[PDB]
Structure 1
Amino acid sequence: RGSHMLDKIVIANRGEIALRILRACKELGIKTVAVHSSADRDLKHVLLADETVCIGPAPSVKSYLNIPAIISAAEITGAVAIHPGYGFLSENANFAEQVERSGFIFIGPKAETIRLMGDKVSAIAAMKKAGVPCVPGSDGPLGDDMDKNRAIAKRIGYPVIIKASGGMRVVRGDAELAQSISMTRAEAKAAFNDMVYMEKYLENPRHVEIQVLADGQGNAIYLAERDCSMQRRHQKVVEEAPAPGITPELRRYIGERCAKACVDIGYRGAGTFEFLFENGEFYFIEMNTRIQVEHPVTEMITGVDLIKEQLRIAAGQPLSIKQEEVHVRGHAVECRINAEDPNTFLPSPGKITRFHAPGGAGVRWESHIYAGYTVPPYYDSMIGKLICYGENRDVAIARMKNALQELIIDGIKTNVDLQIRIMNDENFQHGGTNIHYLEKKLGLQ
């Protein structure tokens, strides 16, 4: 035992993220244990792992969410750590608590941190305390004294939105504040209760998120930001880094705030701070206490291997990277490739009859698919991620177009066509479109 302390690791996940993790492991000489459902015996990473363990039938609830089977998998193989990747049990405290209780290292933050940020009220509370900008509001249920309510809205700045404590109405001026509150009162009465609170209405915001790394020993750094505004039905479709328009100084401002937050909450490992960004102001929404799907975009513009850092941190090693050594270079754009139905956006199962991946400079392909592989119906629609890097934003986009053209995936329905359309969208090329843009372009409004 000694190529890395975490000499053998259980990859509690599937698809592209599991492969991504497997590779990071092989690089470090770490033995891999791929737990899988009976429907994923043909996953690329499973076929490449040192050991494979079936943890149950196709259904996620019976496999990838099966806590005892996953820990038993770690036990029978003498594994020492478990990487939950993203989704599934990655932000499930109970799982982390049992994993560690069984004597294994959970590659993620402390159980108490998952719970903290996992709760919206506790999270906001902690973020404000640490100095992270949050969504302005009445700080509690609104009374009937329209005078302070008008002052609250004023202080927060219109437009404001009235929300029911148990579930909403937009107010653009104090002239309609009173009526609006009463109107909202009624509905909720019904609708739900009578209590109502006020929040700042962020009408046309962008989705900007800050990547961080903390060793849980007092060291925390931020690795630039990512703009993940290209959304359809709240699902991310395109991601890029850095975020267009964000200056080095603003980046430094929001970055140091998140790093400080990590220190205050004793955060450990990789995490992400998602904010709504409008009129140059950041507003914290939530923090994902895990690795991000779109992490590659950050990896390519900073030259940092986020998965490997997660492993080193989980191995008790303090951060070896100082904030001043972190330099953003170039631009990276990510298109998510999904095997999805164009009318429901749901997974579109089937056999891939022909597959050809794009190649060339600045082209990264994260995917488990291969000619002959069949997309199962039990999980998500994501079959891969295509990330293109360039010395600047225009080069990255130009490369994504070229790469999307070389990409061949027959036998199943995909969104490749959609991606090409987005890369050719004049507004996207200009940069900085808000979270409502995509649904507009395609009329899902």
Structure 2
Amino acid sequence: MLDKIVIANRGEIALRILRACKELGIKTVAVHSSADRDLKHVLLADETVCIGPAPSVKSYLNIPAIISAAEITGAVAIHPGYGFLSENANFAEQVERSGFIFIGPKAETIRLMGDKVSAIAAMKKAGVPCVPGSDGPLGDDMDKNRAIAKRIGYPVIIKASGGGGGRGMRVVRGDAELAQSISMTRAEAKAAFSNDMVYMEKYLENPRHVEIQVLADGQGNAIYLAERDCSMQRRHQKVVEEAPAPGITPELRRYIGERCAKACVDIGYRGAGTFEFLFENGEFYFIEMNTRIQVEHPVTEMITGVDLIKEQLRIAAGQPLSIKQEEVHVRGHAVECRINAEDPNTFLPSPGKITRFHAPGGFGVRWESHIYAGYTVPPYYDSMIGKLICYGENRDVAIARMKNALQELIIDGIKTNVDLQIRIMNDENFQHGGTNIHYLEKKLGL
């Protein structure tokens, strides 16, 4: 087991990682910006280092300051959480070169899967179904670009290979728009990612966003831990996630899960990861892989009993997976509501002092948050302040508990999306299940 780790992150995920460390008897080093001195996990950590002033560029993205803190505290490993440096291949490489364990994949694996064209080629080669596409970057030959759109069938979508979070994407519905759409996607990718490489996929009009959790030890063993439906979203921000996905049979789960586990073996994957799919008319189509733990990991933990952060720490310590595939059982249902310091109607961010705070309780109710009464949500970071996860023996019980938990949750002094989450839980289409990625934008547009 790792003697001591740096938690290279903040907010709810830093606290999540701290708890996993304490359960395993791992010493914690909380690195923080000067604005994050009062984070709950900093106040609970064995040691603390202030790594710079508020802005992330000076603190949480500051590679020399983080490595320096890990050196002076005698830590042996760094957990990057999600966001910040978690998919920064140069960071992973520097951590290993400075003689630390990186709690995540090999740097070369982060590079492979962070380049969307090379990632799709690897997945297609492994037997993972992908979206009908260019299967390679687009050139400047518009005869060949039109021939790819024709074979695929309009509508199509142009994506940046260095792209992500929905930025650097353009839908094309006929030939007249194709040349200008490719040119503009290139220019946007070059200006943002210093990488003008683009590819083409068939555009699916009304898919669900369904993702497969994996764990691999990097020693030849890989398992899948069912799927999450992340379709309830607004402007490429997930709002509700659930596990398992409604309408997914055991035979479908097994089909796509086995192809994801086999892909992990083929690419030498190490640690926690997520395969993202479009799911439409009963078919899965790979779009991209997250090479890190994700925000919504708790819904998978509730339905499998697997602690994904502890597994990340065991794998990083060099332990092979102890869990075999035949020991992974989907049981019951879990829903996660993201709690954001933003206006429930305008989504204007709402940093500020929380003047009153009460967390929900009950059977099947899990609260993941650093916030407390008197804590100031700072203006410098993300709006996501907490995650409310409710489990039941079925989806209806999970939703019933979430409605009750949302009604107990008090956060005064800032705006939150708690009232939006209550509306979503009361929505008849959500209660039926299986709504598509466009549903929440449509409901709010009315």
- Asked if these proteins are the same fold (TM beyond 0.5), I'd say yes
Contact residue 347 and residue 379 of structure 1 kept, 8 A:
no
Whole-Å Cα distance in 2 between the matches of residues 248 and 278 of structure 1? 17
Contact residue 5 and residue 26 of structure 2 kept, 8 A:
yes
2:117 to 104, 117, 121: 121
Whole-Å Cα distance in 1 between the matches of residues 305 and 85 of structure 2? 28
1:289 counterpart residue number: 291
**Is residue 94 of structure 2 the alignment partner of residue 98 of structure 1?**
yes
Whole-Å Cα distance in 1 between the matches of residues 37 and 435 of structure 2? 41
For residues 137 and 31 of structure 1, do their structure 2 counterparts lie closer, same or farther at Cα, with a shift above 3 Å needed? same
For residues 178 and 31 of structure 1, do their structure 2 counterparts lie closer, same or farther at Cα, with a shift above 3 Å needed? closer
For residue 365 of structure 1, give the secondary structure of its aligned residue in structure 2.
strand
1:410 to 403, 407, 412: 412
Whole-Å Cα distance in 1 between the matches of residues 91 and 71 of structure 2? 15
1:197-251: per-residue Cα shift (whole Å, max 9, x none)? 7531200011000000000010000000000011111000000000000111101
| Superposed counterparts of 1:11-160, under 5 Å | 11-139=7-135, 156=152, 159-160=155-156
Contact residue 108 and residue 289 of structure 1 kept, 8 A:
yes
1:260-304: per-residue Cα shift (whole Å, max 9, x none)? 111000000000011111111111111110001100000000000
Whole-Å Cα distance in 1 between the matches of residues 376 and 59 of structure 2? 19
For residue 47 of structure 1, give the secondary structure of its aligned residue in structure 2.
helix
1:162-196: per-residue Cα shift (whole Å, max 9, x none)? 7899x688677999999999999999999999999
For residue 291 of structure 1, give the secondary structure of its aligned residue in structure 2.
coil
For residues 256 and 395 of structure 1, do their structure 2 counterparts lie closer, same or farther at Cα, with a shift above 3 Å needed? same
For residues 141 and 221 of structure 1, do their structure 2 counterparts lie closer, same or farther at Cα, with a shift above 3 Å needed? closer
Q: CA deviation at 1:138?
A: 3.9
- Bigger CA drift: 308-317 or 126-135? 126-135
Q: CA deviation at 1:156?
A: 3.9
- Bigger CA drift: 275-284 or 9-18? 275-284
For residues 14 and 224 of structure 1, do their structure 2 counterparts lie closer, same or farther at Cα, with a shift above 3 Å needed? same
Whole-Å Cα distance in 2 between the matches of residues 93 and 144 of structure 1? 30
- Bigger CA drift: 152-161 or 377-386? 152-161
| Unmatched runs of 5 consecutive residues or more in structure 2 | 162-167
Contact residue 6 and residue 315 of structure 1 kept, 8 A:
yes
For residues 411 and 250 of structure 1, do their structure 2 counterparts lie closer, same or farther at Cα, with a shift above 3 Å needed? same
For residues 360 and 170 of structure 1, do their structure 2 counterparts lie closer, same or farther at Cα, with a shift above 3 Å needed? closer
Question: How high is the sequence identity, in percent, across the aligned residues?
Answer: 100
Whole-Å Cα distance in 2 between the matches of residues 120 and 237 of structure 1? 24
Contact residue 209 and residue 279 of structure 2 kept, 8 A:
yes
Q: CA deviation at 1:430?
A: 0.6
Contact residue 346 and residue 381 of structure 1 kept, 8 A:
no
Q: CA deviation at 1:151?
A: 8.0
Q: How many residues align?
A: 439
1:243 to 245, 248, 256: 245
TM-score, normalised relative to structure 1: 0.90
Whole-Å Cα distance in 2 between the matches of residues 396 and 441 of structure 1? 22
Q: CA deviation at 1:345?
A: 2.5
For residues 124 and 144 of structure 1, do their structure 2 counterparts lie closer, same or farther at Cα, with a shift above 3 Å needed? closer
For residue 45 of structure 1, give the secondary structure of its aligned residue in structure 2.
helix
Contact residue 224 and residue 251 of structure 1 kept, 8 A:
yes
Whole-Å Cα distance in 2 between the matches of residues 379 and 185 of structure 1? 29
For residues 251 and 339 of structure 1, do their structure 2 counterparts lie closer, same or farther at Cα, with a shift above 3 Å needed? same
For residues 71 and 427 of structure 1, do their structure 2 counterparts lie closer, same or farther at Cα, with a shift above 3 Å needed? same
User: Once superposed, what is the RMSD of the aligned Cα atoms?
Assistant: 3.5
Contact residue 89 and residue 95 of structure 1 kept, 8 A:
yes
Q: CA deviation at 1:96?
A: 1.1
| Superposed counterparts of 1:17-416, under 5 Å | 17-139=13-135, 156=152, 159-160=155-156, 198-342=200-344, 345-416=347-418
1:133-161: per-residue Cα shift (whole Å, max 9, x none)? 11102445889999998986675456545
Whole-Å Cα distance in 1 between the matches of residues 188 and 381 of structure 2? 37
Q: CA deviation at 1:94?
A: 1.0
- Bigger CA drift: 286-295 or 132-141? 132-141
1:90-146: per-residue Cα shift (whole Å, max 9, x none)? 110111111111111110000100111111111111111111111102445889999
Contact residue 120 and residue 135 of structure 2 kept, 8 A:
no
For residues 162 and 60 of structure 1, do their structure 2 counterparts lie closer, same or farther at Cα, with a shift above 3 Å needed? closer
For residues 41 and 176 of structure 1, do their structure 2 counterparts lie closer, same or farther at Cα, with a shift above 3 Å needed? closer
Q: CA deviation at 1:379?
A: 0.2
For residues 320 and 189 of structure 1, do their structure 2 counterparts lie closer, same or farther at Cα, with a shift above 3 Å needed? closer
1:64-97: per-residue Cα shift (whole Å, max 9, x none)? 1111111111111111111111110011011111
Whole-Å Cα distance in 2 between the matches of residues 24 and 108 of structure 1? 15
For residues 160 and 35 of structure 1, do their structure 2 counterparts lie closer, same or farther at Cα, with a shift above 3 Å needed? closer
Q: CA deviation at 1:406?
A: 0.5
TM-score, normalised relative to structure 2: 0.90
User: Of the two, which has the highest radius of gyration?
Assistant: 1
For residues 343 and 78 of structure 1, do their structure 2 counterparts lie closer, same or farther at Cα, with a shift above 3 Å needed? same
- Bigger CA drift: 194-203 or 311-320? 194-203
